[PDB]
Amino acid sequence: EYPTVSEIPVGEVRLYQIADGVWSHIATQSFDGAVYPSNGLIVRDGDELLLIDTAWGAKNTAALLAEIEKQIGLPVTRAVSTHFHDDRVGGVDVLRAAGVATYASPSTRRLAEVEGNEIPTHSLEGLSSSGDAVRFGPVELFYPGAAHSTDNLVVYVPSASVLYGGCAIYELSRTSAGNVADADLAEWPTSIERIQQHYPEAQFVIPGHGLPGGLDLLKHTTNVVKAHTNRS
Ligand SMILES: O=C(O)c1ncsc1NS(=O)(=O)c1ccccc1
Ligand SMILES: [Zn+2]
């Protein structure tokens, strides 16, 4: 029942209730002739919603807000982007125009600026050193260290034991490294072990792309990263 590219037209978004007051959002983008899904998170914050990551671009993100509006019917007041790439900040300007307060670390804002990407308005302090965690409403934000990108954050919903790994965590189906241009391969496994150490109780692990699972996604990702590191 988890939505795949199958159930999702180009320019459309599906929501998936993972737990009470926690959903993933699923969108698709065409890239180099293939079609790849992407996940973000939606977390109920009393009578409002906290959004984790855009739906990979302005059109998808306007569909996401319409689909939230239609299916949950609570306002999105804040959004956090988990790193600087376009599947995470692309659509920020849409969210901003809808009155959503957009947030990212200074590290992510700096990198999004160097990249010419959209730049979330608000700064998330206290995440600059590996292993930093800060509370953000119904979630904890964690900086595990450099992995998929130097700035990548992970998100934990303590009430539902939902860990959103973002692009630092691969789905089981992904058996080779994806985009690693901005990755720190030497630190990625160490950063994953920081996630392991910090959230050993997590019950649902949502990767940046694809199928949810459990904490076996962290080891899976370690395996894939090391295999890549050892390419000859
Ligand atoms: O890993 C990711 O988080 C990722 N996010 C968007 S795309 C991609 N991975 S990707 O398909 O392998 C790629 C991107 C850009 C250029 C080539 C390949
Ligand atoms: Zn990325």
Ligand SMILES: [Zn+2]
């Ligand atoms: Zn990605």
